[PDB]
């Protein structure tokens, strides 16, 4: 009980009010493996896109809860969306969190997941720190209730006890669709704009390939792929369910930090969610015979296609076989300006 | 970029050509796979030339090189005897 | 033996001009039905933990049963 | 009283490091106590660790400091430092520093490189990198200019809109002389012992901001709306929000002299906490043969 | 046009053949993740 604490008083400058919670050790398992995280707040909106300005949250692991009923880590969900009077609440509305250590890892939650527990568990001198002193007294089992989390399956535990008019406030909070949908096909927007790319790439040359890696390739290429077997080209826009993971916009975040690459891996045809947005060095002395060593060993995987984005406005398909696709990268620079504001600071 | 390698060798100028291909025999066709031999020009691969004999039993025997800063690794090929020859294309 | 084409930047893919058209198609109808059902469930998950709000707005208004 | 402490080795010194020791000669090395490992600072600043600067402060500043004056092969003679001896030290060092302000001296790890103090030893197991030795303005503006680096390095990297990396190296960077600027090498994680002088440090802020004469911001404010001091532009014609909001209270006498006795005793348990590492005082540098007569203070 | 040719070991110049410039495919076993995952495509199919 100690991040509650430190967050209430710091976050007093970009958010009115300040929600507590905790995060189970099972439901973060599958967005960061082996404990790597130990984060920052933008709540964007449902109908209201646009931007938002962001807010620092503080956090710790490895300290257990006060219920035996599972044992996990702490975190705390800042709400200072609704405009004026924070009567309102607004629904069907995400809160992304960006849990790390050193950026990998998001946490998208509600507010109906949030509320809908919230409501369901209820010679001078130093000044003291005033909204410590409530919490010790509490030490109860009813704050803390289960709710079923929407984004995974799974239970989240939230915790609050009745503080102080803020706290008082929220309770007492009701109001009278489209949060999650505009990320995802807004990814496939411009996931079909790079797949045009693709065709009128290979419309205008001869539809043939450069082979800009080198591979040797049996002579039964031909026949172990069937003729034409771009299926896994064919369904590769199904499969980028992930984006800010995805090497994709990587590189758009990559232009305010010039050879630089990185590259997303997907199975020669569903062998599981392979991994995205790896990098490609060239800084370091490794050098250039290492990134060539690495650019041959992803050439090389014959059961994976690799997409490549560089930072100066090119995009590159990488057929296993070594075969490449020329391909551009120009977007609007309103999605551009969106993307790293919904990742950070422009 | 083009590179001036040297050989030592026991053998007859019939076999260093021979033994010449096959230890070029990457380098030939990676500027075949890079570089296309457009024009009718390009398709000799270099050239050697004796640049004499010496004693094979005493032969080569290293050293070190020294400027003001650095050293590099040197062979020294001692009491050499000089004869040159013309250029034999390697194809 | 077995013999594997040379690692040469002249070396053809076997052309595709036609089967790239169809593909998007047939990905765009499988991405809806995927997109679909995770709406589907979703808002399952959301009928789900709504209706615990009016269970529990249903025992606030029982207070009032409770002393009549 | 003795001084001569020789120190054998242990293998057959190589003729190619007996002429770059002969070149390093009245330099400063760090003592152990003889052995031949740690007589020098490769044992806690190595190529493994991420120089933090400050465990091998803690080294050099704990351990009596060494002249190293002779140079033989399978023997080397080395002079401690005792307080209430002159020491004779030459200045040779390569990011030079001329002694023109004559005025006390400081040691320093070797912060501008590992190249510049380094001496490959093949024959022991052993390798030897040196200490810096700089004047006391130079260390302290040096010293304050890493603490500030490693810890808002470490907060750059907590952004996740991380724009400007480049920013704090190149304002940051480099020193401050007037002769010229010399870049300095830079750690990326502050390691275990900057986090604790950033601990202790701010626990004395922390301590000291809760007690501010109110007197001085009044002052402030008023010649914030007097001319524009040069010392002044700092401000750039602005008063912020903070001393607008803890300046509700009046002008009293009654709480300023016990928050002035406050303030004097813990602005000298920083000065104590800042006087860290070993210090010479200099008398009559002498300009022409770059040698110093220095004892311990 | 292409060339064929049998084997060669590690290479420095990189167009050269190799047994690290090799794409290691199995076709089984690709037959077999390509079959598989038809058959799930195909329950895909008539879902909603």
Same mark, same amino acid.
């Given at each position: 009980?100690?991040?509650?604490?430190?967050?209430?008083?710091?976050?007093?400058?970009?958010?009115?009010?300040?929600?507590?919670?905790?995060?189970?050790?099972?439901?973060?398992?599958?967005?960061?493996?082996? =404990?790597?995280?130990?984060?920052?707040?933008?709540?964007? !909106?449902?109908?209201?896109?646009?931007?938002? =300005?962001?807010?620092?949250?503080?956090?710790?692991?490895?300290?257990?809860?006060? =219920?035996?009923?599972?044992?996990?880590?702490?975190?705390?969900? $800042?709400?200072?969306?609704?405009?004026?009077?924070?009567?309102?609440?607004?629904?069907?509305?995400?809160?992304?969190?960006?849990?790390?250590?050193?950026?990998?890892?998001?946490?998208?939650?509600?507010?109906?997941?949030?509320?809908?527990?919230?409501?369901?568990?209820? +010679?001078?001198?130093? $000044?003291?720190?005033?909204?410590?002193?409530?919490?010790?007294?509490?030490?109860?089992?009813?704050?803390?209730?289960?709710? @079923?989390?929407?984004?995974?399956?799974? @239970?989240?535990?939230?915790?609050?006890?009745?503080?102080?008019?803020?706290? &008082?406030?929220?309770?007492?909070?009701?109001?009278?669709?489209?949060?999650?949908?505009?990320?995802?096909?807004?990814?496939?927007? *411009?996931?079909?704009?790079?797949?045009?790319?693709?065709?009128?790439?290979?419309?205008?040359?001869?539809?043939?390939?450069?082979?800009?890696?080198?591979?040797?390739?049996?002579?039964?290429?031909?026949?172990?792929?069937?003729?034409?077997?771009?299926?896994?080209?064919? !369904?590769?826009?199904?499969?980028?369910? *992930?984006?800010?993971?995805?090497?994709?916009?990587?590189?758009?975040?990559?232009?305010?930090?010039?050879?630089?690459?990185?590259?997303?891996?997907?199975?020669?045809?569903?062998?599981?969610?392979?991994?995205?947005?790896?990098?490609?060095?060239?800084?370091?002395?490794?050098?250039?015979?290492?990134?060539?060593?690495?650019?041959?060993?992803?050439?090389?995987?014959?059961?994976?296609?690799?997409?490549?984005?560089?930072?100066?406005?090119?995009?590159?398909?990488?057929?296993?076989?070594? !075969?490449?696709?020329? &391909?551009?990268?120009?977007?609007? $620079?309103?999605?551009?300006?969106?993307?790293?504001?919904?990742?950070?600071?422009? | 970029?083009?590179?001036?390698?040297?050989?030592?060798?026991?053998?007859?100028?019939?076999?260093?050509?021979?033994?010449?291909?096959?230890?070029?025999?990457?380098?030939?066709?990676?500027?075949?796979?890079?570089?296309?031999?457009?024009?009718?020009?390009?398709?000799?691969?270099?050239?050697?030339?004796?640049?004499?004999?010496?004693?094979?039993?005493?032969?080569?025997?290293?050293?070190? !090189?020294?400027?003001?800063?650095?050293?590099?690794?040197?062979?020294?090929?001692?009491?050499?005897?000089?004869?040159?020859?013309?250029?034999?294309?390697?194809? | 033996?077995?013999?594997?084409? @040379?690692?040469?930047?002249?070396?053809?893919?076997?052309?595709?001009?036609?089967?790239?058209?169809?593909?998007?198609?047939?990905?765009?109808?499988?991405?809806?039905?995927?997109?679909?059902?995770?709406?589907?469930?979703?808002?399952?998950?959301?009928?789900?933990?709504?209706?615990?709000?009016?269970?529990?707005?249903?025992?606030?208004?029982?207070?009032?049963?409770?002393?009549? | 009283?003795?001084?001569?402490?020789?120190?054998?080795?242990?293998?057959?010194?190589?003729?190619?490091?007996?002429?770059?020791?002969?070149? =390093?000669?009245?330099?400063?090395?760090?003592? @152990?106590?003889?052995?031949?490992?740690?007589?020098?600072?490769?044992?806690?600043?190595?190529?493994?660790? *991420?120089?933090?600067?400050?465990?091998?402060?803690?080294?050099?500043?704990?351990?009596?400091?060494?002249?190293?004056?002779?140079?033989?092969?399978?023997?080397?003679?080395?002079?401690?430092?005792?307080?209430?001896?002159?020491?004779?030290?030459?200045?040779?060092?390569? $990011?030079?520093?001329?002694?023109?302000?004559?005025?006390?001296?400081?040691?320093?790890?070797?912060?501008?490189?590992?190249?510049?103090?380094?001496?490959?030893?093949?024959?022991?197991?052993?390798?030897?990198?040196?200490?810096?030795?700089?004047?006391?303005?130079?260390?302290?503006?040096?010293?304050?200019?890493? +603490?500030?680096?490693?810890?808002?390095?470490?907060?750059?990297?907590?952004?996740? &809109?991380?724009?400007?990396?480049?920013?704090?190296?190149?304002?940051?960077?480099?020193?401050?002389? +007037?002769?010229?600027?010399?870049?300095?090498?830079?750690?990326?994680?502050?390691?275990?012992?900057?986090?604790?002088?950033?601990?202790?440090?701010?626990?004395?802020?922390?301590?000291?901001?809760?007690?501010?004469?109110?007197?001085?911001?009044?002052?402030?404010?008023?010649?914030?709306?007097?001319?524009?001091?040069?010392?002044?532009?700092?401000?750039?014609?602005?008063?912020?929000?903070?001393?607008?909001?803890?300046?509700?209270?009046?002008?009293?006498?009654?709480?300023?002299?016990?928050?002035?006795?406050?303030?004097?005793?813990?602005?000298?348990?920083?000065?104590?906490?800042?006087?860290? &590492?070993?210090?010479?005082?200099?008398?009559?540098?002498?300009?022409?043969?770059?040698?110093?007569?220095?004892?311990?203070? | 046009?292409?060339?064929?040719?049998?084997?060669?070991?590690?290479?420095?110049?990189?167009?050269?053949?190799?047994?690290?410039?090799?794409?290691?495919?199995?076709?089984?076993?690709?037959?077999?993740?390509?079959?598989?995952?038809?058959?799930?495509?195909?329950?895909?199919?008539?879902?909603?």
């Amino acid at each position: 009980m100690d991040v509650h604490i430190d967050n209430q008083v710091l976050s007093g400058l970009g958010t009115p009010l300040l929600v507590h919670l905790f995060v189970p050790d099972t439901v973060m398992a599958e967005l960061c493996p082996n =404990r790597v995280p130990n984060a920052w707040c933008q709540t964007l !909106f449902s109908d209201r896109t646009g931007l938002t =300005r962001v807010c620092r949250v503080f956090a710790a692991r490895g300290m257990l809860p006060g =219920r035996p009923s599972h044992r996990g880590t702490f975190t705390s969900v $800042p709400v200072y969306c609704d405009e004026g009077l924070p009567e309102l609440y607004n629904p069907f509305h995400v809160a992304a969190l960006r849990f790390y250590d050193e950026l990998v890892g998001e946490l998208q939650i509600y507010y109906l997941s949030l509320f809908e527990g919230a409501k369901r568990a209820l +010679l001078s001198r130093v $000044p003291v720190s005033f909204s410590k002193t409530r919490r010790a007294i509490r030490e109860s089992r009813a704050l803390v209730r289960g709710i @079923a989390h929407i984004f995974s399956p799974h @239970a989240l535990y939230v915790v609050t006890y009745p503080e102080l008019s803020a706290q &008082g406030r929220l309770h007492r909070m009701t109001a009278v669709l489209g949060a999650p949908e505009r990320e995802f096909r807004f990814l496939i927007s *411009v996931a079909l704009r790079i797949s045009a790319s693709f065709r009128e790439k290979l419309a205008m040359q001869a539809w043939t390939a450069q082979q800009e890696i080198p591979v040797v390739i049996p002579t039964s290429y031909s026949r172990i792929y069937k003729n034409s077997d771009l299926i896994r080209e064919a !369904f590769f826009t199904v499969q980028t369910r *992930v984006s800010w993971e995805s090497c994709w916009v990587k590189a758009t975040i990559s232009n305010a930090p010039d050879a630089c690459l990185w590259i997303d891996s997907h199975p020669l045809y569903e062998e599981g969610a392979s991994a995205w947005g790896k990098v490609i060095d060239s800084r370091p002395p490794g050098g250039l015979v290492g990134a060539a060593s690495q650019l041959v060993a992803l050439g090389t995987d014959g059961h994976c296609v690799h997409l490549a984005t560089t930072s100066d406005g090119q995009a590159f398909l990488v057929l296993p076989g070594g !075969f490449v696709i020329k &391909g551009q990268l120009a977007l609007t $620079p309103e999605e551009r300006g969106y993307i790293l504001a919904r990742h950070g600071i422009r | 970029g083009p590179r001036f390698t040297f050989f030592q060798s026991s053998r007859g100028h019939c076999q260093i050509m021979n033994i010449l291909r096959i230890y070029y025999s990457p380098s030939i066709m990676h500027r075949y796979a890079v570089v296309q031999p457009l024009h009718i020009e390009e398709l000799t691969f270099g050239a050697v030339a004796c640049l004499g004999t010496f004693s094979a039993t005493d032969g080569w025997r290293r050293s070190a !090189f020294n400027y003001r800063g650095s050293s590099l690794p040197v062979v020294e090929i001692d009491s050499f005897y000089s004869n040159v020859s013309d250029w034999e294309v390697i194809l | 033996p077995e013999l594997m084409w @040379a690692p040469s930047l002249r070396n053809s893919l076997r052309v595709s001009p036609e089967a790239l058209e169809l593909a998007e198609r047939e990905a765009e109808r499988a991405r809806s039905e995927r997109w679909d059902r995770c709406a589907q469930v979703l808002k399952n998950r959301l009928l789900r933990v709504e209706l615990d709000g009016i269970m529990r707005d249903h025992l606030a208004r029982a207070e009032e049963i409770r002393q009549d | 009283m003795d001084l001569k402490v020789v120190v054998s080795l242990s293998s057959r010194l190589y003729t190619d490091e007996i002429a770059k020791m002969q070149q =390093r000669i009245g330099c400063i090395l760090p003592l @152990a106590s003889q052995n031949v490992q740690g007589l020098g600072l490769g044992q806690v600043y190595s190529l493994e660790t *991420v120089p933090d600067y400050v465990s091998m402060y803690n080294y050099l500043s704990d351990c009596t400091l060494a002249v190293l004056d002779e140079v033989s092969v399978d023997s080397l003679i080395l002079t401690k430092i005792v307080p209430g001896q002159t020491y004779a030290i030459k200045n040779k060092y390569q $990011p030079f520093f001329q002694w023109h302000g004559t005025g006390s001296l400081s040691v320093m790890p070797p912060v501008f490189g590992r190249e510049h103090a380094t001496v490959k030893l093949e024959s022991n197991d052993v390798d030897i990198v040196f200490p810096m030795v700089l004047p006391t303005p130079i260390a302290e503006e040096v010293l304050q200019k890493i +603490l500030l680096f490693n810890v808002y390095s470490r907060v750059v990297m907590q952004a996740p &809109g991380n724009a400007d990396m480049l920013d704090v190296h190149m304002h940051l960077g480099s020193v401050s002389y +007037l002769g010229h600027h010399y870049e300095l090498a830079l750690p990326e994680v502050p390691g275990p012992l900057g986090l604790a002088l950033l601990d202790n440090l701010s626990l004395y802020f922390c301590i000291m901001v809760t007690l501010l004469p109110r007197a001085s911001m009044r002052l402030v404010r008023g010649l914030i709306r007097h001319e524009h001091h040069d010392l002044l532009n700092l401000f750039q014609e602005m008063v912020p929000d903070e001393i607008a909001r803890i300046d509700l209270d009046d002008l009293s006498v009654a709480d300023d002299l016990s928050r002035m006795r406050v303030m004097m005793t813990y602005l000298q348990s920083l000065a104590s906490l800042f006087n860290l &590492g070993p210090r010479l005082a200099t008398a009559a540098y002498s300009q022409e043969t770059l040698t110093a007569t220095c004892w311990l203070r | 046009d292409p060339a064929r040719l049998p084997r060669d070991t590690g290479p420095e110049l990189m167009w050269a053949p190799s047994l690290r410039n090799s794409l290691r495919v199995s076709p089984e076993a690709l037959e077999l993740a390509e079959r598989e995952a038809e058959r799930a495509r195909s329950e895909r199919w008539d879902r909603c």
